[PDB]
Design a protein around this ligand. Structure first.
Ligand SMILES: CCCCCCCCCCCCCCCCCC(=O)OC[C@H](COP(=O)([O-])OCC(O)COP(=O)([O-])OC[C@@H](COC(=O)CCCCCCCCCCCCCCCCC)OC(=O)CCCCCCCCCCCCCCCCC)OC(=O)CCCCCCCCCCCCCCCCC
Ligand SMILES: CCCCCCCCCCCCCCCCCC(=O)OC[C@H](COP(=O)([O-])OCC(O)COP(=O)([O-])OC[C@@H](COC(=O)CCCCCCCCCCCCCCCCC)OC(=O)CCCCCCCCCCCCCCCCC)OC(=O)CCCCCCCCCCCCCCCCC
Ligand SMILES: CCCCCCCCCCCCCCCCCC(=O)OC[C@H](COP(=O)([O-])OCC(O)COP(=O)([O-])OC[C@@H](COC(=O)CCCCCCCCCCCCCCCCC)OC(=O)CCCCCCCCCCCCCCCCC)OC(=O)CCCCCCCCCCCCCCCCC
Ligand SMILES: CCCCCCCCCCCCCCCCCC(=O)OC[C@H](COP(=O)([O-])OCC(O)COP(=O)([O-])OC[C@@H](COC(=O)CCCCCCCCCCCCCCCCC)OC(=O)CCCCCCCCCCCCCCCCC)OC(=O)CCCCCCCCCCCCCCCCC
Ligand SMILES: CCCCCCCC/C=C/CCCCCCCC(=O)OC[C@H](COP(=O)(O)OCCN)OC(=O)CCCCCCC/C=C/CCCCCCCC
Ligand SMILES: CCCCCCCC/C=C/CCCCCCCC(=O)OC[C@H](COP(=O)(O)OCCN)OC(=O)CCCCCCC/C=C/CCCCCCCC
Lengths: 90, 253, 107, 37, 110, 253, 90, 110
């Protein structure tokens, strides 16, 4: 994934927080996934506003947080690839 | 300018020997939005029919609890809504936005059954329907139109400008540029016409082979990137699904 | 059955004939000209109709004014003419016809 | 060209009237309508 | 106007000698009336294409003067390619026969 | 060529400075049907999905009493129907034809509910569905496409031809046409450039005024013709309706 | 009306006589009218095949029959315009 | 390339003296850095328009060589308009000072 976080201003992302939920399509099969808007808003605390790209519609996160996120993704992916993975995240 | 759009389709175009034609109009002219850089007053205006939208608006306002807005907008819009013509958002784009931002299936189905498939929502409609500012809705519509800039936009027609000075300068150009033996030179006939004609013939004969041989690598890279994205997303999704049932331990305890 | 013949477009779309113009009168030109003679103000070269222009042209052609001059009058204009000089030079490729022209004038 | 323009106007102004089967100055020669009385 | 490139290609094929033999073979069992009618039909097809397609289509050379400019350009090209060449030849001829300006000399004084 | 179409809309076009662009293809090229005069082999081919049409065909054949045709067409069409791409008839045109030729409302509604709005019927489908010849269906499709010739048709791509001879002739052209003082003449600078530039500037500045002043008369004539047609048709219709009940006198007697 | 009768060949008028009825829209309001195909076919007995216009898709009738048809139309129209018209065509 | 007509019009307005007074008034409360940044931004906007719109749009002058031909034409026009004019002036200067070809004469023999 890229470090491009869409601006939640209505001129860019119309209707961001009008409802308490976000939805996304995942993969080639386009599975649906719903995510709480608070879980999402947790990103805009690490978002950095000095940086703006792609027609000034996307900000960038701080590398610390972005790489923590990438590491969680990578851990999940390698666990999926492996077979001795733990049956729980506890 | 940035390349806007959410599509992964690697698209190239081939050209014809015919120009784009639009219906005759004595006051409007069609042009590219990025090449024109138009303003709100440069955009052309027209009148749109209200009722089909005013019914849905009355419903939404009775649901949300704001009828002053409906009354004001209806008194403004009677005898048709006068609005810029090529500043709109399509029903499909609006539905995608609603779905990804969390509007309920009931509301989405209401939208679908209420409006036709080829309906075009303009920024005043969007603003009065979502309690937003017409400025922000205008900017959103402009971004969504620039995402699909192959479609020309309709501006107010303006006569040409500076024709007399341009005529003077073009006369000066010819007077200084054709008073010579350049187009009759041995250099011309030996290098300029042969090299140029050979380049033109080779380009016309291998126009597509060259393009394909150049675009092979970019196509392969785009394919690889998309495959990697898909596989990673799927793996993460299925693993989180596996670990989704690790919260009930507490309420069991 | 299936279609295998290569159907040309001329069996489907027929082009209009525009090379030679239409004749809404459905009458030939000489018959038009003849009919105009008996119409008022269009007799032969009187009037300002096309038939009048055509008859005036034929009349000046039938006259003598546009015929070539006689040998007794050649040296008035023709022997000092650009057309004559250019033709003489062209049909005598590598020669100079000034002397022969002087002799033609003498003749 | 004059003839062409004349016929081009005659087309538009006559061919879709239903009232000009011919020229009005010669309507005396038309048969009589069995519906009038 | 249209299909100038096709016209150039037709001229090329016409000058190619092999096409002369091909045409000699094609002229077997053929009449002058048929040849003339075919040529006239080809010309009419070109002009009819123009008349029909100008109503709805615009070429890359479309301009506020339309096909008038393309026709003027055809005329000017013909002029500069043929008539000015003939003028050059005639000028050299006159200069070798009489001297430059020899065709505009005054008659010998009497 | 004749101007085909059943429309009374006086339509003129204004041009842009951009050329028509189509998606990239290594084997096809888009062109105008009337300017190309293509043949069936010049047309490009593609594969179309059968099932949606084969279901309706099975229904129609079970109704009419000819199943050998369905069986043959299905065995021919399996793995997709290979057919010329831009030889088709739209659903709207087909429905208009059916209605004006007397097909029942049940059959028309079956068509409507069975096929989408943007479906495109090709000549083999038409032939097998109406027990006609593919040749006649092809000709009908071609006429209906020529009626709307603003849409380009897709042909097989062919390399240019006679490039070497064309290069020779163009070299000869420049060698004979630019070896002169034409583009540097007092005549040029005094008449050719001034007159031409003035005509161009006036045309660019009054491009639309001229067109409107010329088209005024034609627009008025077309309006008059349409009004006369409508009024006459309506009068005749209502009078025949008045006199429609003059046949029951006999069965009363 | 014009003397342009469409050819009933399927290459021109697809599905002419497949059913026993024809339908047309009349006037600005586009009223529907149904006509028997035999009443229609009565025209192709006067149609002349030597004449073909408009991309060779329309033949022309013989002037006698065409003008009889025009006269019937004109009579109906003038009767509609008049008020002393007969209440019946008997 | 694009907007050549607009460029000609800009040159015309620039040479028009009234525009000189207009610019004199506009330069009130303005900095050289601002002027330079504005000009650079205008040039960048032109080139960015090109880079973006060449991906999906084709101009009336599109050809199998693309914008290379338009750029070559710009160069050739500049050449014939400015450099050949300067060459003509230099030729007349040399012919008046030394004679035709005077700049290529051999050194005086010793
Ligand atoms: C060191 C040795 C060398 C020294 C000598 C130097 C010599 C220099 C000579 C001066 C010329 C400089 C070159 C520029 C020329 C102008 C080009 C131009 O602008 O044309 C475009 C102009 C604009 O049209 P457009 O571009 O198509 O569209 C824009 C709109 O028009 C919209 O346009 P706009 O809104 O921007 O302006 C409109 C304006 C356009 O009219 C014009 O053409 C402008 C002409 C102004 C010339 C001023 C020359 C100043 C320098 C000389 C000083 C003379 C003392 C006078 C001082 C001025 C006070 C009166 O006027 C009008 O169109 C009509 C309305 C009138 C309103 C009032 C205008 C006057 C304003 C007050 C004066 C402002 C002075 C500014 C201060 C200057 C300080 C340096 O249209 C024209 O082409 C006008 C006609 C062209 C003029 C020539 C007419 C033919 C006569 C030829 C002369 C004879 C042949 C030569 C033989 C001579 C033998 C003696
Ligand atoms: C003389 C030629 C030789 C020149 C010197 C030798 C130099 C050799 C090097 C060549 C390098 C070429 C430079 C390439 C860089 C790119 C240039 C470019 O593409 O944009 C040019 C530029 C197009 O601007 P744009 O950014 O593409 O925007 C287009 C507009 O939106 C408008 O949109 P639109 O859709 O309405 O039209 C688009 C476009 C359409 O352009 C076309 O597609 C051409 C249409 C006809 C097709 C056949 C073309 C050739 C034969 C007819 C034209 C003869 C003139 C040669 C034109 C060469 C360019 C094709 O419009 C034009 O470009 C009009 C050009 C034709 C103007 C005719 C003026 C006649 C006065 C001269 C007397 C007649 C000719 C004398 C014989 C000359 C024989 C050499 O064309 C202009 O010149 C703008 C004129 C503005 C008004 C000025 C006041 C009127 C003065 C008229 C003369 C204007 C200067 C032209 C001088 C040539 C005539 C003497
Ligand atoms: C030198 C110019 C002065 C000439 C002598 C003075 C005469 C003055 C009177 C002018 C009268 C003009 C005649 C008007 C009648 C209508 C003509 C017309 O519109 O159709 C022409 C015709 C277009 O045919 P078409 O029926 O419209 O069908 C188009 C195709 O479907 C293809 O579709 P497409 O979409 O792919 O492309 C459409 C169109 C696109 O045309 C355009 O829009 C032009 C594109 C660039 C925009 C800027 C144009 C000006 C600056 C760049 C071009 C410089 C050359 C000047 C071109 C003038 C024409 C615009 O294609 C072309 O026309 C290509 C023309 C450019 C060929 C460049 C060859 C370079 C060799 C010479 C060395 C470089 C130049 C030396 C400096 C010369 C300075 C004067 O163009 C051709 O010449 C066909 C060539 C066939 C291959 C021949 C083998 C290669 C030989 C190359 C030279 C071909 C002859 C051109 C001589 C000029 C170069 C020396
Ligand atoms: C009265 C005093 C004056 C009298 C003297 C008159 C002098 C006349 C001279 C003769 C030339 C006439 C003008 C036409 C020239 C040809 C133009 C042409 O066709 O080019 C287009 C040609 C076709 O290409 P394309 O148009 O782009 O596309 C079409 C395809 O190629 C498709 O093309 P295709 O399918 O139609 O044909 C293909 C053919 C294209 O190859 C050619 O270029 C054709 C050249 C044939 C010349 C024959 C001259 C006959 C008259 C002289 C008699 C000589 C005795 C030999 C008799 C022939 C039996 C061997 O061959 C090939 O491409 C390769 C395959 C080989 C297959 C076999 C070909 C031979 C067929 C059997 C002979 C047929 C004879 C027909 C009977 C003639 C009866 C009158 O491509 C070329 O340009 C070829 C290169 C150009 C030739 C010159 C090469 C550079 C050498 C320059 C000479 C040195 C500079 C001068 C200094 C000399 C100092 C001594
Ligand atoms: C008078 C009643 C007729 C009125 C006109 C109605 C139209 C009649 C149509 C008749 C068709 C005649 C077609 C003639 C075809 C001509 C063929 C042709 O030209 O052959 C040559 C030959 C002429 O040869 P040249 O005399 O050598 O001329 C050489 C030129 N330098 O043709 C003729 O002879 C045509 C003769 C008729 C010429 C026209 C007569 C013009 C006379 C004008 C009226 C003169 C009035 C004078 C009255 C005198 C008052 C005191
Ligand atoms: C801008 C204003 C321009 C006006 C110029 C228009 C000039 C019009 C005058 C010409 C007509 C004058 C009538 C002369 C009749 C004289 C009496 C007469 O009948 O003599 C007959 C006599 C024929 O006799 P023969 O030669 O012996 O016949 C031998 C047969 N082989 O008639 C003639 O000679 C013909 C006279 C030719 C007149 C000169 C032609 C001039 C060319 C004019 C055409 C060019 C366009 C003119 C502009 C049009 C103005 C409306």
């Amino acid at each position: 994934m890229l470090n491009f976080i869409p601006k939640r201003c209505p001129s860019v992302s119309l209707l961001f927080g009008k409802r308490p939920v976000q939805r996304i399509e995942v993969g080639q099969a386009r599975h649906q996934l719903e995510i709480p808007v608070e879980t999402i808003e947790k990103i805009y605390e690490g978002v950095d506003s000095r940086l703006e790209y792609h027609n000034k519609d996307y900000n960038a996160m701080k590398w610390k947080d972005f790489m923590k996120l990438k590491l969680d993704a990578y851990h999940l992916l390698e666990a999926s690839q492996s077979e001795t993975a733990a049956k729980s995240a506890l | 300018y940035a390349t806007l759009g959410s599509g992964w389709s690697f698209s190239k175009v081939q050209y014809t020997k015919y120009r784009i034609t639009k219906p005759w109009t004595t006051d409007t002219t069609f042009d590219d939005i990025i090449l024109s850089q138009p303003s709100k007053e440069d955009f052309a205006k027209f009148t749109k029919e209200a009722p089909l939208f005013l019914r849905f608006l009355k419903l939404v306002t009775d649901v949300e609890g704001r009828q002053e807005a409906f009354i004001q907008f209806a008194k403004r819009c009677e005898n048709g809504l006068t609005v810029e013509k090529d500043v709109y958002v399509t029903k499909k784009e609006l539905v995608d936005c609603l779905w990804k931002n969390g509007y309920t299936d009931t509301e989405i189905n209401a939208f679908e059954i209420a409006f036709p498939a080829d309906y075009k929502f303009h920024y005043p409609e969007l603003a009065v329907l979502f309690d937003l500012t017409e400025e922000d809705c205008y900017k959103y519509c402009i971004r969504q139109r620039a995402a699909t800039p192959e479609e020309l936009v309709e501006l107010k027609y303006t006569k040409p400008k500076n024709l007399v000075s341009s005529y003077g300068l073009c006369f000066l150009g010819v007077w200084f540029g054709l008073s010579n033996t350049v187009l009759s030179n041995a250099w011309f006939y030996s290098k300029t016409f042969p090299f140029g004609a050979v380049f033109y013939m080779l380009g016309s004969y291998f126009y597509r082979d060259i393009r394909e041989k150049l675009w092979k690598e970019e196509k392969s890279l785009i394919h690889t990137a998309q495959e990697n994205k898909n596989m990673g997303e799927e793996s993460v999704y299925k693993q989180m699904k596996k670990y989704a049932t690790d919260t009930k331990c507490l309420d069991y305890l | 059955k299936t279609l295998e013949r290569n159907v040309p477009m001329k069996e489907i779309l027929q082009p209009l004939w525009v090379v030679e113009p239409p004749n809404f009168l459905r009458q030939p030109v000489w018959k038009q000209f003849w009919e105009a003679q008996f119409a008022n103000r269009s007799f032969f070269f009187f009037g300002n109709a096309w038939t009048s222009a055509a008859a005036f042209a034929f009349f000046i052609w039938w006259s003598r004014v546009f015929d070539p001059p006689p040998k007794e009058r050649l040296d008035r204009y023709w022997l000092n003419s650009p057309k004559f000089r250019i033709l003489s030079a062209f049909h005598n490729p590598g020669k100079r016809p000034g002397l022969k022209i002087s002799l033609m004038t003498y003749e | 060209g004059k003839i062409h323009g004349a016929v081009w106007r005659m087309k538009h102004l006559f061919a879709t009237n239903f009232k000009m089967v011919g020229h009005p100055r010669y309507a005396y020669a038309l048969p009589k309508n069995p519906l009038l009385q | 106007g249209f299909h100038f490139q096709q016209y150039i290609a037709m001229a090329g094929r016409a000058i190619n000698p092999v096409q002369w033999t091909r045409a000699w073979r094609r002229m077997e069992g053929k009449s002058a009336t048929e040849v003339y009618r075919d040529a006239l039909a080809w010309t009419n097809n070109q002009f009819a294409q123009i008349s029909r397609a100008s109503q709805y289509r615009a070429w890359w050379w479309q301009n506020p003067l339309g096909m008038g400019l393309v026709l003027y350009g055809t005329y000017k090209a013909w002029h500069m390619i043929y008539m000015v060449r003939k003028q050059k030849k005639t000028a050299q001829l006159v200069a070798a026969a009489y001297g430059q300006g020899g065709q505009w000399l005054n008659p010998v004084p009497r």
